[PDB]
Amino acid sequence: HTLVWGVWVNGVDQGDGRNIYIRSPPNNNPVKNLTSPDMTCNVDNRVVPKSVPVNAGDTLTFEWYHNTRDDDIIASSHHGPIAVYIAPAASNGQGNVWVKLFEDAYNVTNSTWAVDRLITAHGQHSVVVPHVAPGDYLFRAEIIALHEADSLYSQNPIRGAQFYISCAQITINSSDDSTPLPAGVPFPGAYTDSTPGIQFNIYTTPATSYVAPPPSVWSGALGGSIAQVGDASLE
Numbered sequence: 001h002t003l004v005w006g007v008w009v010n011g012v013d014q015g016d017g018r019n020i021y022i023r024s025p026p027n028n029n030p031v032k033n034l035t036s037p038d039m040t041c042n043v044d045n046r047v048v049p050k051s052v053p054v055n056a057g058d059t060l061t062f063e064w065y066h067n068t069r070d071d072d073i074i075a076s077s078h079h080g081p082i083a084v085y086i087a088p089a090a091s092n093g094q095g096n097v098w099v100k101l102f103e104d105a106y107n108v109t110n111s112t113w114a115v116d117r118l119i120t121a122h123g124q125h126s127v128v129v130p131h132v133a134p135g136d137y138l139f140r141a142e143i144i145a146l147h148e149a150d151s152l153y154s155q156n157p158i159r160g161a162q163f164y165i166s167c168a169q170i171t172i173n174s175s176d177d178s179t180p181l182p183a184g185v186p187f188p189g190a191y192t193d194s195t196p197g198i199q200f201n202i203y204t205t206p207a208t209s210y211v212a213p214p215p216s217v218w219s220g221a222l223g224g225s226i227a228q229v230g231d232a233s234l235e
């Protein structure tokens with residue numbers, strides 16, 4: 001159970017974005033129905049009034065929270081991977097438009113899931129803004145919590161993989177457009193009961209054997225990280 005508070009650009013807090021530049025849901029309940037329109041940008045998908053200004057090569061940091069900003073972020077039980085997708089705001093999330101910029105499941109070294117490191121990062125994880133066409137974009141941050149993903153929602157509607165999905169409105173101003181954005185996958189649509197990483201038992205199976213859902217990270221992606229970039233408590 002977790003939501004996005006707002007974003008930092010190159011370590012600069014852009015302020016509360018909820019229902020302003022984040023298409024926020026009315027609460028932190030997970031999305032579980034893989035076929036639902038709710039898979040696109042969560043249960044409250046509509047153009048909100050603002051879009052954050054960035055340029056190619058900027059560091060965009062999502063900040064998540066549980067009850068209050070900079071609290072415990074997400075329950076320690078919600079072990080899982082973290083992904084970030086981009087689509088043209090054009091699409092409004094519809095069609096084969098979602099392009100993956102970032103994937104992080106399990107770090108063998110530290111033996112932490114992405115979600116574990118997000119809690120440590122005070123809810124902060126980042127992507128470097130790719131060199132796509134200047135214009136208006138949605139950045140879709142997705143946390144998959146697997147604490148009940150041993151079942152499928154379609155077979156047992158009180159269990160299943162849990163999706164914490166937040167779409168940010170981002171306007172890319174300066175970019176040489178050296179990596180034009182290809183077509184991508186639909187949400188709903190890319191995840192089905194058979195897709196790897198959707199049904200998995202973190203209780204019986206080792207986290208090294210975990211394989212996050214497709215698609216693969218676009219070669220145009222400039223990577224990212226899970227780690228605090230700024231102090232919310234100084235505001």
Ligand SMILES: OC[C@H]1O[C@@H](O[C@H]2[C@H](O)[C@@H](O)[C@H](O[C@H]3[C@H](O)[C@@H](O)[C@H](O[C@H]4[C@H](O)[C@@H](O)[C@H](O)O[C@@H]4CO)O[C@@H]3CO)O[C@@H]2CO)[C@H](O)[C@@H](O)[C@@H]1O
Binds near residue numbers: 074075077148
């Ligand atoms: O831990 C292994 C065990 O986990 C079982 O699943 C547990 C989760 O572990 C636990 O974290 C989860 O707690 C939920 C709780 O159900 C929610 O109702 C509550 O929702 C609150 C919310 O947190 C508030 O922020 C908001 O204001 O109000 C809502 C509405 O009440 O959020 C917490 C997590 O933050 O509960 C699960 C029980 O199903 C697995 O079932 C089991 O298989 C595992 O072995």
Ligand SMILES: *[C@@H]1O[C@H](CO)[C@@H](O)[C@H](O)[C@H]1NC(C)=O
Binds near residue numbers: 157
């Ligand atoms: C999942 O969402 C689809 C499309 O909105 C809907 O028809 C279906 O009834 C939902 N499944 C459940 C269990 O509600």
Ligand SMILES: [Cl-]
């Ligand atoms: Cl839960």
Ligand SMILES: [Cu+2]
Binds near residue numbers: 001002030075078
């Ligand atoms: Cu939860």
